[PDB]
Design a protein around this ligand. Structure first.
Ligand SMILES: [Pt+2]
Length: 160
């Protein structure tokens, strides 16, 4: 279970983002460049109807491939339905829209084996305010792996 952005203005998360940091409940979800949930968000695209398209990069067949996940709005605020990366939900935890956004993905069937969270930033500075916000949010969650990236890796295909 989770603590979410219940006042989320979906339209204001539009545009460019970089993955600064990631955390997962299970080491195996992030423990290699090919791990199923090691994904790098490039862009969030709200639809006119309040759905969300997430553009990301993922090492696949020995290439940095572009993926688009379609996230459909639900009757619960800040919770979107997906069918991707063996996940079925996206939760937005916290954002100021202009600097940082924290979100998680999970399988509702097995959240403690599926839970992956990301710190997104608007610009490739090692955002210590963003990392601090992510730290505060992860305080609550049962995370056993935490990864961070340097400014340089944010602007690279699939973070080097
Ligand atoms: Pt909030």
């Amino acid at each position: 279970v989770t603590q979410t952005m219940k006042g989320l203005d979906i339209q204001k998360v539009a545009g460019t983002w970089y993955s600064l940091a990631m955390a997962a409940s299970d080491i195996s979800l992030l423990d290699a460049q090919s791990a199923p949930l090691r994904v790098y968000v490039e862009e969030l695209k709200p639809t006119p109807e309040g759905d969300l398209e997430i553009l990301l990069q993922k090492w696949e067949n020995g290439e940095c491939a572009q993926k688009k996940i379609i996230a459909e709005k639900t009757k619960i605020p800040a919770v979107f339905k997906i069918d991707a990366l063996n996940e079925n939900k996206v939760l937005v935890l916290d954002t100021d829209y202009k600097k940082y956004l924290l979100f998680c993905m999970e399988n509702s069937a097995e959240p403690e084996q599926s839970l992956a969270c990301q710190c997104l930033v608007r610009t490739p500075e090692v955002d210590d305010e963003a990392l601090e916000k992510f730290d505060k949010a992860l305080k609550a969650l049962p995370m056993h792996i935490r990864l961070s990236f340097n400014p340089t890796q944010l602007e690279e295909q699939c973070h080097i």
